[PDB]
Amino acid sequence: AIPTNFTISVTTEILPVSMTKTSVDCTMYICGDSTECSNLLLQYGSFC
Amino acid sequence: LQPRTFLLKYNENGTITDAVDCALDPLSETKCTLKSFTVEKGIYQTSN
């Protein structure tokens, strides 16, 4: 079975390339701008 | 005297040879965050 006529058919194709370059700061998140919380979070270590 | 957060660089023999503040210059804050005195090219994020 040999084709006798054709058809050109555009087909979209979507791909993600990047997400939103977020960024999180400990001392502002973990601590509500308090200082004692900053002392404790400094006591925990190098998580930030 | 002020309430600071210094970074004391000891030596082979065992005494504090050099140090860097953590509020003197933004580059000093950069060294204070990177935890060394070798800050290569590039944008760093130190504080808020």
Cβ contact, residue pair A28, B48, below 8 Å: yes
C-alpha B21, offset from chain centre: 6
Q: Which two tokens stand for residue B31?
A: 């060294």
Q: How far apart are CA B29 and CA A4, in angstroms?
A: 73
Q: Which two tokens stand for residue A22?
A: 């977020």
If you measure CA to CA, which chain B residue comes closest to A26? B47
Q: Amino acid identity, residue A14?
A: I
Q: What is the resolution of this structure in A?
A: 3.6
Task: Spell out the alpha helix ranges (H) of A1-48.
Answer: 26-29, 36-44
Please tell me the experimental approach by which this structure was elucidated.
Answer: cryo-EM
Contact map slice: B 17-46 vs A, CB within 8 A: 45
- Residue whose tokens read 């997400």: A19
If you measure CA to CA, which chain B residue comes closest to A28? B48
